Amino acid sequence: GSMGDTFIRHIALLGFEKRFVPSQHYVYMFLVKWQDLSEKVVYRRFTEIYEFHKTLKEMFPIEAGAINPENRIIPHLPAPKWFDGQRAAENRQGTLTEYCSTLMSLPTKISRCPHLLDFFKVRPDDLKLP
Template sequence: MAQVPKRLMTAVNVDRAEKRRVPSKHYVYVIEVTWDDGSETIIFRRYSKFFDLQINLLETFPREGGLKDPSTRIIPYLPGKILFRRSNIRDVALKRVQSIGEYCKDLIKLPDYIVQNPLILDFFETKPEDLKSHETDNTTNIKSWKKDSIDISQPILPEPYVVTKDYEKTQAKELSSR
């Protein structure tokens, strides 16, 4: 029996971040997904799910992730993890909306053999938690981003570095590399 091909994304738009209170306080990114069959869905993903996807993509496609040769990298960079105090979580979520949106748009522009990989297809598919009712007492819309809005500043992405030789730290503020 022939396997039915999965539908593909034709567009993604990260509209905003929303606060969730269940099972604990956290923020999700609201992602509108348009599919090649003409359907549209809205999914909600935490930053940690994006991070997991990125790690899995780099492990599955090491060449495309620039593991050995950074010049071969085609997998987009995910905005980095940020260590922050509890009071800054909202600000970090708001600042990431645009860069997470660009990341999603860049993902679906990758070559077919990557975009059609279950890692990406499953990430953008609707999950049971996306279908649950999100009543106003469970969520708080913290910001709607308009396309014509001007951002005063954007996150500064760190320059990627390639380790060429092992290094043992000699001071507490340094990092060892292998």
């Protein structure tokens, strides 16, 4: 075999972004730092981060059961539309803010390794847009 997927150094978030398609929703401009591929840029959305996380919990119920109570610091909470106002703002601005720090922390380094890599190397908005 040979290397052809590799691994991650870390994540650094840049800020905002404007994705008016394929539906109306602003998104966040994220910087992924690879230890081989070097600097790489990717665009990320709310429902996508939720779908990721949800998929982790679906495929891995342990990562959402054995890692849920003991590690009761995983970013949960609904989407920013239940309290449409400053508490909708501070939902996404806290949930993402925590998921970046937490996706980095998770002890699921065996479960989440290919997931994170597939969070970034797949990015259907960076180079696999609608």
